[PDB]
Amino acid sequence: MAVKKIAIFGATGQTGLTTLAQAVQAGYEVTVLVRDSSRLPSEGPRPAHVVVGDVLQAADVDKTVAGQDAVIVLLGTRNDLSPTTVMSEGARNIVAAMKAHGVDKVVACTSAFLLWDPTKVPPRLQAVTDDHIRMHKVLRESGLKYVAVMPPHIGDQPLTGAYTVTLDGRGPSRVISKHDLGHFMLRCLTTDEYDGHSTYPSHQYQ
Amino acid sequence: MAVKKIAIFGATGQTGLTTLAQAVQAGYEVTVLVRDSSRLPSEGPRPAHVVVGDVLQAADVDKTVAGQDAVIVLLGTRNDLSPTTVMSEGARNIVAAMKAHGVDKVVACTSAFLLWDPTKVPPRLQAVTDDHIRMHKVLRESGLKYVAVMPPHIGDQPLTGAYTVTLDGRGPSRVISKHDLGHFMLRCLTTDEYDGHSTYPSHQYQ
Numbered sequence: 001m002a003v004k005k006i007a008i009f010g011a012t013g014q015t016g017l018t019t020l021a022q023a024v025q026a027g028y029e030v031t032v033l034v035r036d037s038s039r040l041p042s043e044g045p046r047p048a049h050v051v052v053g054d055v056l057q058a059a060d061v062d063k064t065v066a067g068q069d070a071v072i073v074l075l076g077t078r079n080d081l082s083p084t085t086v087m088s089e090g091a092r093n094i095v096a097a098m099k100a101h102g103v104d105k106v107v108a109c110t111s112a113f114l115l116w117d118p119t120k121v122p123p124r125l126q127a128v129t130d131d132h133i134r135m136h137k138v139l140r141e142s143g144l145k146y147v148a149v150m151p152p153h154i155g156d157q158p159l160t161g162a163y164t165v166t167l168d169g170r171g172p173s174r175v176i177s178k179h180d181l182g183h184f185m186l187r188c189l190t191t192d193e194y195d196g197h198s199t200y201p202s203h204q205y206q
Numbered sequence: 207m208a209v210k211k212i213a214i215f216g217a218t219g220q221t222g223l224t225t226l227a228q229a230v231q232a233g234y235e236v237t238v239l240v241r242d243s244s245r246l247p248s249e250g251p252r253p254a255h256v257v258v259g260d261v262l263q264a265a266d267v268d269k270t271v272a273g274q275d276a277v278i279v280l281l282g283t284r285n286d287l288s289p290t291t292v293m294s295e296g297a298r299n300i301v302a303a304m305k306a307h308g309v310d311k312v313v314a315c316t317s318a319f320l321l322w323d324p325t326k327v328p329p330r331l332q333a334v335t336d337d338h339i340r341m342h343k344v345l346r347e348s349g350l351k352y353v354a355v356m357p358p359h360i361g362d363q364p365l366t367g368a369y370t371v372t373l374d375g376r377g378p379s380r381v382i383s384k385h386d387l388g389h390f391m392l393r394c395l396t397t398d399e400y401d402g403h404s405t406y407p408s409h410q411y412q
């Protein structure tokens with residue numbers, strides 16, 4: 001495997017769990033950063049390496065990025081919609097670690113709202129969207145090989161591998177399953193064609 | 207009251223650098239206060255005068271303000287996550303220096319958080335916002351002609367000169383390009399219509 005060692009940030013989350021399971025099945029040697037109170041579930045897939053800590057500590061992010069081939073970022077705030085900088089500050093630490101350790105490839109999830117007319121973004125989701133905007137600027141300005149993944153609504157539909165990938169604009173559907181989103185994050189490790197683009201994965205489940 | 211000579215504080219920052227560049231291209235005689243002159247670009251537009259020192263040092267601020275027609279303030283304490291007083295103590299020094307030298311016009315950047323509910327502030331930005339509020343009060347209470355510039359997200363989009371300014375709060379956008387923000391700071395030197403007002407610049411790009 002050319003890319004074989006990967007860090008996943010947010011592996012315990014909705015998309016992270018199925019991304020982790022798919023990566024382990026595909027032969028990746030996965031390192032995760034998990035907060036001490038929220039470890040991976042007991043008998044799901046086991047990653048190769050676990051760092052317990054916080055993306056808001058540069059030291060913990062450095063430990064997680066060291067020695068990787070690539071980084072996948074699925075940070076988020078679960079059902080909490082309050083103002084936050086955890087995604088943007090976490091990305092700042094991830095950028096600094098990747099530069100210090102010679103890692104170039106980062107595939108990172110923000111949101112399709114970065115491609116919406118700003119006056120149409122739902123106000124209830126605007127605090128989170130603000131930090132996605134901050135996070136995207138951090139990653140775009142870093143000079144790293146950054147794939148900006150900007151999904152629409154994340155659902156519980158199957159893994160299909162059959163989704164549309166729209167470059168630098170909104171796509172033709174308004175959902176992507178969490179499993180297909182994770183599949184796409186991993187696909188981005190095997191190609192350079194999305195580097196420096198925004199990507200909107202979406203599908204019609206039928 | 208033609209403004210020819212300005213001081214810029216914060217000229218090495220993201221907004222400061224493009225404000226300086228635009229000011230030099232437009233013809234202003236610019237004085238900057240920098241802690242490290244090697245953070246100024248060695249090519250292209252350069253300031254007329256460089257004072258090496260610290261905004262916390264009253265004598266360095268006095269040296270920078272002497273003889274100016276107006277002052278632009280683009281200070282920031284980016285890294286600070288917990289109580290900090292650099293911006294407000296700097297503003298106190300700038301105010302005392304402007305009074306001592308008969309400089310009447312100051313255009314200073316805080317943030318749009320000062321226009322929105324305090325609960326909108328991400329916890330890790332509360333300390334910077336608290337000191338923006340302190341700086342804003344220092345400048346409002348000074349009696350100087352003060353334009354308060356309260357931008358939302360500062361982006362990287364190319365200069366347009368086509369942004370909207372709302373004298374109080376809302377707009378097409380929660381983003382202003384750093385280039386457009388610097389353009390607006392300089393526009394405030396050529397008019398008195400924003401004196402004693404808060405301003406919110408924003409724009410929809412792309």
Ligand SMILES: NC(=O)c1ccc[n+]([C@@H]2O[C@H](COP(=O)([O-])OP(=O)(O)OC[C@H]3O[C@@H](n4cnc5c(N)ncnc54)[C@H](OP(=O)(O)O)[C@@H]3O)[C@@H](O)[C@H]2O)c1
Binds near residue numbers: 014087
């Ligand atoms: N329809 C949607 O839901 C939708 C649509 C578009 C975009 N998005 C965005 O897509 C991204 C992924 O969403 P998701 O639903 O898969 O994620 P999620 O379930 O919200 O999971 C967030 C992950 O981030 C981890 N995390 C949070 N703070 C951390 C910290 N300080 N240190 C280390 N890890 C931290 C969480 O760990 P813990 O286990 O410790 O909490 C969890 O693993 C999010 O940014 C989201 O806003 C969602």
Ligand SMILES: NC(=O)c1ccc[n+]([C@@H]2O[C@H](COP(=O)([O-])OP(=O)(O)OC[C@H]3O[C@@H](n4cnc5c(N)ncnc54)[C@H](OP(=O)(O)O)[C@@H]3O)[C@@H](O)[C@H]2O)c1
Binds near residue numbers: 215219315360
């Ligand atoms: N980032 C955003 O999206 C955003 C949004 C709204 C408002 N704001 C606020 O906008 C203002 C400007 O932001 P920015 O990103 O353009 O600033 P920045 O890139 O963080 O630059 C801060 C500037 O202030 C200088 N500075 C800091 N401490 C100093 C000191 N003791 N003495 C002399 N100079 C000092 C810095 O000098 P050095 O180069 O020597 O460090 C630098 O030039 C800030 O107050 C910020 O909080 C930012």
Ligand SMILES: O=C(O)c1cccc(-c2noc(-c3ccccc3F)n2)c1
Binds near residue numbers: 079080128152154174
């Ligand atoms: O409907 C669409 O096209 C669309 C596009 C972008 C994002 C979304 C979206 N829905 O829930 C969320 C969300 C829910 C919980 C937490 C954070 C979120 F971000 N985000 C929907």
Ligand SMILES: O=C(O)c1cccc(-c2noc(-c3ccccc3F)n2)c1
Binds near residue numbers: 131284
């Ligand atoms: O990132 C910082 O250091 C910082 C410091 C002070 C204010 C701000 C700020 N105000 O509005 C916003 C904002 C608004 C909409 C979207 C994204 C944003 F980021 N951001 C940021």
